[PDB]
Amino acid sequence: WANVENLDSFLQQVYTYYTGKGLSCIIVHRLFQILTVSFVIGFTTFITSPITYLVLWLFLSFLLALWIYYLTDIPRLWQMREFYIHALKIATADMPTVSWQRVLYRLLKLKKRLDAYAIANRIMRKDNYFIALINNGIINIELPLLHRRILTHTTEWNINWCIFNFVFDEQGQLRSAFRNPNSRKRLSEELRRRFIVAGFLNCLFAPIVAIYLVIHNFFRYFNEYHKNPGALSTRRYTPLALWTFREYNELQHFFDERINDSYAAASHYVSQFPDFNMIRLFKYISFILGSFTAILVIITVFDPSVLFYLGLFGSLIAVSRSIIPDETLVFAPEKALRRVITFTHYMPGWWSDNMHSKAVQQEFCSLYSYRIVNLLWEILGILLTPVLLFFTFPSCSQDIVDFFREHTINVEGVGYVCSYAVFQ
Amino acid sequence: WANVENLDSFLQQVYTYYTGKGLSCIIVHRLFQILTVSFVIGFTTFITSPITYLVLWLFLSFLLALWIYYLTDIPRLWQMREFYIHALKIATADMPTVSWQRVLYRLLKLKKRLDAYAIANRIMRKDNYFIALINNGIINIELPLLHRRILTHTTEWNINWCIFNFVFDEQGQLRSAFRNPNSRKRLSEELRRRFIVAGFLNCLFAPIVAIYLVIHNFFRYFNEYHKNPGALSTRRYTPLALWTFREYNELQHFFDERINDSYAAASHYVSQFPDFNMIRLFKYISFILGSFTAILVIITVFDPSVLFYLGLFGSLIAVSRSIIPDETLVFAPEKALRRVITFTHYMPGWWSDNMHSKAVQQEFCSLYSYRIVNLLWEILGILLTPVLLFFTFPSCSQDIVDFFREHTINVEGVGYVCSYAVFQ
Amino acid sequence: WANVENLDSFLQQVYTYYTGKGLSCIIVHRLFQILTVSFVIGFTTFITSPITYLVLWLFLSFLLALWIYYLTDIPRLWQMREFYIHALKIATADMPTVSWQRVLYRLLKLKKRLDAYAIANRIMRKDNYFIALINNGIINIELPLLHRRILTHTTEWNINWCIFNFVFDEQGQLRSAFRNPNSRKRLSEELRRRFIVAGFLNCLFAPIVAIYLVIHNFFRYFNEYHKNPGALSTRRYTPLALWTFREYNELQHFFDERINDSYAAASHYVSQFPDFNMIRLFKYISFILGSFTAILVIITVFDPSVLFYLGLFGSLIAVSRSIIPDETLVFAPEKALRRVITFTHYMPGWWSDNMHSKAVQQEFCSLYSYRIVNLLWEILGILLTPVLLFFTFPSCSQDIVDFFREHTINVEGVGYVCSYAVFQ
């Protein structure tokens, strides 16, 4: 590896081999991914059975492209596995459980600079620019009519292809033409001619991706969402909430740990806002039905459709007892919210006034939505991303170019990084 | 509010509007309260159907008095809601979740002194005297024959009407005649002529209140206590335990929070005292029945009323497994008790010797009783309070007067407070 | 002050009015400064008494220029005094003792951003670039032949006139042409044509400044350095040591406090390196002379030029006792050095190996020199600065330009600051 001369991509591959947990796990996951896609395709073309033949040929050609890419990438995985076993001296059996600090320790042992912070800046060199574009509103992801900021996975794929393939070298570093203030008019017009091409390609590949996605999600979740409604209120952070919470140089797996360790706190928080005027009503109704049931039971022990009424009242009382919280339950929304914020690290300025508020809870529930709503939006966004790539993104092209010139700072030994990554 | 000149009652109304959680919640609770009373009355007069007409007229006249009082009080609630929205700038939607410290912050912003501690001393000016009368034995609430200290809700209503209406101004402050040591013989005899009148009124309104209370509690709890015995061992603090734990100037909702946050610790503590000589016996019996069942099952797999015996033994073994605790369970009564005391703040002097003891647990279970026992005593105390108001309270009248003269201290900017409130 | 539009210079004037401690103290100091200069001139032209008339006319013309400038600047001082009394509400009697945090508090009360850190970045906007040029070797201040880094006060005056008058606006901010990478060849050649002009002016004003300086220092220090040699070993930090210790955005008076609070630690540290092979010799010599003196005193009490020998031996023994340290004295150079570094905040990388070392002490004594050596070098540097401005500075001109383009970062609300000021 002494002849890399492309240290950024090498470190990124080291990291994605770590988070993939070795060649075995990576190959297994990719295999089951293409198997799931192919099963969806085959089962959908079976239960429904010219135009059908042509669209099936299209789908299977995409599947074969995926397969061919995976087969092409296998050798790079082997090179990295060899680098892990031999150079890093990390056992193939230690992969699913070794930490990133241990890999960093071995990597510093093996060998301008390779500090932990430097390696984080080199792995996340483009992700930091993405965090800074999204969080600072440099790029407008708000729909023109629906008035909503949506960040699907196709949105960020298109952002990474239009911008970060155009702004960064093949060697993976900010091109020279993006700090020259005189070229700000040529680049800011060769960038709209990329947004337009990506919008054209998405207007062709977005229907046949949203269709596959809705079919896959239906097949996967129909069983649970019609035979287990308890798992219908499972809440998760929206994909835009996961880029609002992200910090700079915070590698993906650290972020995943500290976000998964926050769902307990968030589920607790969103429950600290009961409806007392409704709890009181249901307490009253439970009292009435309990009086009726007491009379009925005390009269049936002396005269053995009163059983229908007894069953109905038992059902209604069991319904009511679920709404009525425990007596010895202390509701404290502000400390629940602070317990959440110790994980999400995200407290807007105007929260600090009223963290007990209900408006704060409305906002946090805009960030922490239902999983089914997240699915509906991850399907509608694949359709509405061409709207962005045609109407809101070109108008924001100039700014983007300027953002890469103003807010780029040279950190010695790393290179040109985002200027926001060096503050926080 | 610049023309109040009755700051104590104004602050008390601010506080009870806070703890009632706004005009909406207060009105809803009062409405469902009169609805529950009226439903009990109507259903009891229905399932049972002169004397009946007369007693029904009496009950409905009391109900109408309650209704008329609530309708009379509504305008004061509106005045306070206006003061909350306009002057305090607390949103009507922030009421169920705003804290008392936020209300104090707004109230100090708006405007002798209005510190947090001063407002607590003005809201709890009579409650501090009550805590000091009850905890220091100035007033004797021990029954003459049953030899038990009972503090029902009617007991404290009678104490607040006999004493605190006679001792405190209409403006809500210690009358002047109660610090003059020469009038200690006139006041200590105009106070027995109040205990006697209250005893006479209670000997008339105590039967028709205990009757309503037992009917209400029967209707409410018969369903749960005959169809869910698991909620028969629900333990709660007796009303006298809640005045023993109360601290001075600790507003009601803080006390409620720290008492509700103690039921987990108390339930844990009362379980750290198993019967080892009984656990051993049930372990032996489970072993015997398991041997029998093993033989029976191993003999029925070769010869398919042995099923009756198998079912009976399964039932008995399931019974036995519930008593036998887990093996890896560590019983530690002293640290459980300390975990409780960190909430109740109540450790008598003689506990500090043996907090591992069983006598300490007997006392704490006198404080932390069963809810059904609490109901039986809250019904028997409504009957036995005239005994107090006739025989034990007059004999303790003199002391009471002296208590208000000796143990009153003038805190500057607040007024005459209890001398115990300023120590702890 | 709402119409300033030159916030940087306004804040710098606020700060220099604070550190000057009011109009009274500023005027008094300037007055005694011109009085000291004029006294030196008059006394030197008196004790020595064409060429004399001409050089005296030159000196007095410089004095009159200084006087005229002070008289010109008085009105700005009055404007700032009014701003301090009226707007800031800081009493004229509170000036010599008010802190900078109190001035910051008042200034934030009065009114893109005016945080403490922002005001520090605006006051020290050019000083941060100076710290970064000097500490990072962007500019070469090492003499070509003597091989020594000298930073006189004239050196930094010339740096501030050649560079910071050319690089920064009249409004006080980095000119636009210094971030355009295409103009790096025009600016890097209009900067050598400034170093050359400054070298020419210094080759004319350096003799008649070094002469005045040596005369002033002779007059001031001859008395103390010939009639009090105890104040000849007074050590101070060299002017280059005071730019090596300086941190970014550390205002001048904070730096002065933490450097003055370090001279005790430095004086302690430089004494932890005694010469044991010399202490032993002087102990032996003191023993010999004490034996001789004991014999002489015990023989003169029986036979009253032995007195000459007794006096000489007393003198030599008094000399020896000064070198020999106390017995109960514990020498610990490493913790003395750490006590120093807690103030200077300056520990090179190669110190961390051997902080007990003698080479570390040699380096620290290169930083912490004798005051008389500092005077000799502050006089020789005024002569040798044209050498820098002619031979070492032009060769380093290009780099300087690049330094202002590479290492400039835009902090929002402040402006273009040095990129090193935002790290540490």
Ligand SMILES: CCCCCCCCCCC(CCCCCCCCCC)(CO[C@H]1O[C@@H](CO)[C@H](O[C@@H]2O[C@@H](CO)[C@H](O)[C@@H](O)[C@@H]2O)[C@@H](O)[C@@H]1O)CO[C@H]1O[C@@H](CO)[C@H](O[C@@H]2O[C@@H](CO)[C@H](O)[C@@H](O)[C@@H]2O)[C@@H](O)[C@H]1O
């Ligand atoms: C005719 C078929 C049409 C569509 C086919 C299927 C859709 C496309 C799938 C392909 C592909 C993009 C890349 C292709 C690049 C190959 C080059 C192509 C040829 C170029 C010549 C999907 O990538 C995205 O697909 C999205 C759906 O399309 C998913 O959205 C979801 O929607 C809802 C669903 O439940 C969800 O609720 C919602 O939460 C999602 O937002 C995303 O989750 C996913 O990231 C695969 O790449 C990626 O897949 C993901 C796991 O998916 C892998 O994540 C992790 O990997 C390990 C960490 O390294 C971890 O250890 C591992 O734990 C983890 O899995 C990635 O590593 C990577 O492998």
Ligand SMILES: CCCCCCCCCCC(CCCCCCCCCC)(CO[C@H]1O[C@@H](CO)[C@H](O[C@@H]2O[C@@H](CO)[C@H](O)[C@@H](O)[C@@H]2O)[C@@H](O)[C@@H]1O)CO[C@H]1O[C@@H](CO)[C@H](O[C@@H]2O[C@@H](CO)[C@H](O)[C@@H](O)[C@@H]2O)[C@@H](O)[C@H]1O
């Ligand atoms: C009709 C056939 C359907 C075919 C659909 C397209 C098939 C091609 C997909 C291939 C392709 C898009 C590229 C070409 C797209 C051109 C326009 C596409 C328009 C559609 C016509 C998607 O593939 C990527 O998708 C990403 C999203 O899941 C995954 O990131 C996961 O996220 C976490 C989840 O939370 C997981 O936890 C984590 O383990 C994964 O990292 C990747 O693992 C995956 O490889 C590969 O490019 C990718 O390069 C890299 C940056 O160089 C970017 O990957 C990530 O970005 C950050 C995000 O988080 C991550 O921080 C960072 O880790 C990573 O850098 C992507 O931006 C993407 O650009």
Ligand SMILES: CCCCCCCCCCC(CCCCCCCCCC)(CO[C@H]1O[C@@H](CO)[C@H](O[C@@H]2O[C@@H](CO)[C@H](O)[C@@H](O)[C@@H]2O)[C@@H](O)[C@@H]1O)CO[C@H]1O[C@@H](CO)[C@H](O[C@@H]2O[C@@H](CO)[C@H](O)[C@@H](O)[C@@H]2O)[C@@H](O)[C@H]1O
């Ligand atoms: C012909 C009918 C005969 C009897 C009728 C019903 C009995 C009397 C009910 C009337 C009334 C006294 C005041 C009357 C003043 C009006 C003036 C009258 C006209 C004057 C011209 C009951 O007051 C007491 O009644 C006792 C029973 O009698 C209860 O004992 C119980 O027994 C067992 C039961 O389950 C229990 O197990 C046991 O734990 C109890 O000890 C007590 O809990 C209760 O305090 C109503 O006042 C009070 O009610 C209570 C909630 O009850 C309100 O508490 C809170 O309010 C909010 C904080 O501000 C909170 O936010 C809210 O959460 C909370 O609710 C108070 O605010 C206040 O409203």
Ligand SMILES: CCCCCCCCCCC(CCCCCCCCCC)(CO[C@H]1O[C@@H](CO)[C@H](O[C@@H]2O[C@@H](CO)[C@H](O)[C@@H](O)[C@@H]2O)[C@@H](O)[C@@H]1O)CO[C@H]1O[C@@H](CO)[C@H](O[C@@H]2O[C@@H](CO)[C@H](O)[C@@H](O)[C@@H]2O)[C@@H](O)[C@H]1O
């Ligand atoms: C045949 C028809 C049946 C009619 C029965 C009587 C109907 C009249 C009841 C009306 C009346 C009694 C007054 C007249 C009684 C005369 C003799 C009665 C003999 C019966 C013939 C009861 O009404 C009160 O009862 C209290 C008890 O629940 C409630 O306090 C709740 O406690 C917590 C629970 O734990 C809750 O959490 C909390 O939210 C509530 O505060 C009050 O909310 C309620 O208003 C109103 O007067 C009341 O004034 C105030 C102090 O000026 C006192 O209230 C409280 O005291 C402290 C205790 O804790 C509290 O610290 C303090 O907050 C408050 O100051 C009472 O002492 C009482 O005197």
Ligand SMILES: CCCCCCCCCCC(CCCCCCCCCC)(CO[C@H]1O[C@@H](CO)[C@H](O[C@@H]2O[C@@H](CO)[C@H](O)[C@@H](O)[C@@H]2O)[C@@H](O)[C@@H]1O)CO[C@H]1O[C@@H](CO)[C@H](O[C@@H]2O[C@@H](CO)[C@H](O)[C@@H](O)[C@@H]2O)[C@@H](O)[C@H]1O
């Ligand atoms: C024909 C005569 C030839 C020469 C004349 C005399 C030499 C020049 C003197 C003028 C002048 C430069 C500025 C002129 C600007 C006016 C505009 C001109 C007209 C433009 C149209 C000297 O400035 C420098 O002069 C150097 C010598 O030249 C000194 O070097 C010394 O050498 C050895 C000596 O002992 C030393 O050992 C060695 O340690 C030094 O390095 C430096 O100490 C001094 O900084 C005055 O400016 C500055 O003086 C200094 C105190 O001097 C003031 O420092 C502080 O002020 C307060 C904090 O705000 C503090 O509260 C106050 O405590 C403190 O005092 C500054 O505020 C400022 O006022």
Ligand SMILES: CCCCCCCCCCC(CCCCCCCCCC)(CO[C@H]1O[C@@H](CO)[C@H](O[C@@H]2O[C@@H](CO)[C@H](O)[C@@H](O)[C@@H]2O)[C@@H](O)[C@@H]1O)CO[C@H]1O[C@@H](CO)[C@H](O[C@@H]2O[C@@H](CO)[C@H](O)[C@@H](O)[C@@H]2O)[C@@H](O)[C@H]1O
């Ligand atoms: C034949 C007649 C002799 C006439 C000789 C020249 C007379 C002119 C002198 C006037 C002039 C030089 C300007 C023109 C020079 C052109 C070329 C000169 C060639 C000579 C032919 C010197 O005047 C300054 O000299 C400084 C040095 O003492 C003083 O700083 C003191 O340092 C501490 C000590 O340790 C004291 O503690 C502290 O209180 C003082 O701040 C200043 O107080 C003083 O005003 C005024 O310009 C000045 O502007 C400012 C930055 O805008 C700079 O001041 C400081 O720089 C940092 C340093 O530390 C400081 O951090 C910072 O506080 C301040 O910003 C200077 O760089 C200088 O440029």
